[PDB]
Amino acid sequence: HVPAFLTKLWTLVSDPDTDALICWSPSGNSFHVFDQGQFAKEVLPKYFKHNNMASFVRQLNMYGFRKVVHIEQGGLVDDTEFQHPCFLRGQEQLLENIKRKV
Amino acid sequence: HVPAFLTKLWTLVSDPDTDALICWSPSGNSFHVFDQGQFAKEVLPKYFKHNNMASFVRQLNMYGFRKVVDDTEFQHPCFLRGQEQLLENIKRKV
Amino acid sequence: HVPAFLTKLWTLVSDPDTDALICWSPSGNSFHVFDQGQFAKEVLPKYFKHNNMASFVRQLNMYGFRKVVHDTEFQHPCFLRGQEQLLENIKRKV
DNA sequence: TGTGCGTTCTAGAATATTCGCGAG
DNA sequence: ACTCGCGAATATTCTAGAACGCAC
Ligand code: NA
């Protein structure tokens, strides 16, 4: 029913063993990826058939996720945050409302 | 969605800790940059991918700011102290 | 007249310091990137205003580079070891 | 028995940065 | 000769197109 990408992403974010690399934000309305390098090489191949952050990012955009911009990035002086309105901590059933672009 | 340049400009002008280098005018309808040299060298690279005052000014003109005729003053009709919601009306040129 | 990206890219690839992360292929008609995590974190910000491999890859495509399918290998016919003069022919997409 | 999903490589679109022109 | 808005090329970021394999 719910496509594999969303259930794995939900499980991956919620899993407390991965919270050093991917976890919910305190509000539970977005998720963070820390150290993209270790995440792509260590975490992604355990759920998907690849280890590329770009292929994970491409899927995020296919399901309508958007990157959250922090106002402190953009200067010359690793935290990647994504959000979807129906991807909320404690609301796994809401994943049926997220559906992929055709 | 309000572009990063205006949000950063609003934060930088409004911030009282930076007022020795960039701050609102007393009326709050314009802002001043003092000592452009130290501002470009020390403040800009903490917010933008450069330390060039010309590139900051170029963006000011891109968003329709104009210079009011060291001490450099710039103005935009929708860049007003206490009216942060008006940044939504500032649009980049075509 | 040669854009900064091509001169910097030729320089960083040719640099024997970085050959552990980015170097020419034996034939010298393509270049390899090993461990892009460390390449993006340490090499890119020394030449560009960022440390994202995606922003490096995007520029490679804007200049007509192509990824060769088999760590990470890219090629352009006018990007050859010892022929910095051929970069003159690599022209950026509109 | 066609359609939706996943992975990869490249391009689109908006804003950002640089350089130098020219009206006044 | 000089100031100050520009145009234009390139740079950076985030999202999408397109091709192909796979499943049901
Ligand atoms: Na200030």
Author numbering:
A (entry chain B): 14 to 90, 95 to 119
B (entry chain C): 14 to 82, 95 to 119
C (entry chain A): 14 to 83, 96 to 119
Authors' account:
Different from the HSF2 structure, two HSF1 trimers bound to two intact HSEs reside in the asymmetric unit in both structures, where the DNA duplexes were stacked in a head-to-head manner. Like HSF2, Arg117 (corresponding to Arg109 in HSF2) in the middle DBD (DBD II) also inserts into the major groove and forms a direct hydrogen bond with the nucleobase 5′ to TTC. Apart from a purine with an imino nitrogen participating in the contact, the amino nitrogen outside the pyrimidine ring in cytosine may also engage in an indirect hydrogen bond, which, however, is only present in the structure of HSF1 bound to 24-bp DNA that shows more pronounced DNA bending than the other HSF1 structure. Based on these observations, we reason that cytosine is a less favorable nucleobase than a purine at this position because its amino nitrogen is barely positioned at an indirect hydrogen bonding distance with the Asn residue only in a context with sufficient DNA backbone distortion. By contrast, in both HSF1 trimer-binding structures, dramatic bending occurs at both the 5′-proximal HSE triplet and the downstream dinucleotide, although relatively smaller bending occurs at the 3′-proximal nGAAn repeat bound by DBD III.
Heat shock factor 1 (HSF1) and 2 (HSF2) play distinct but overlapping regulatory roles in maintaining cellular proteostasis or mediating cell differentiation and development. HSFs recognize and bind HSEs through the DBD, which is the most conserved and only structurally characterized domain. Here, we present co-crystal structures of human HSF1 and HSF2 trimers bound to DNA, which reveal a triangular arrangement of the three DNA-binding domains (DBDs) with protein-protein interactions largely mediated by the wing domain.
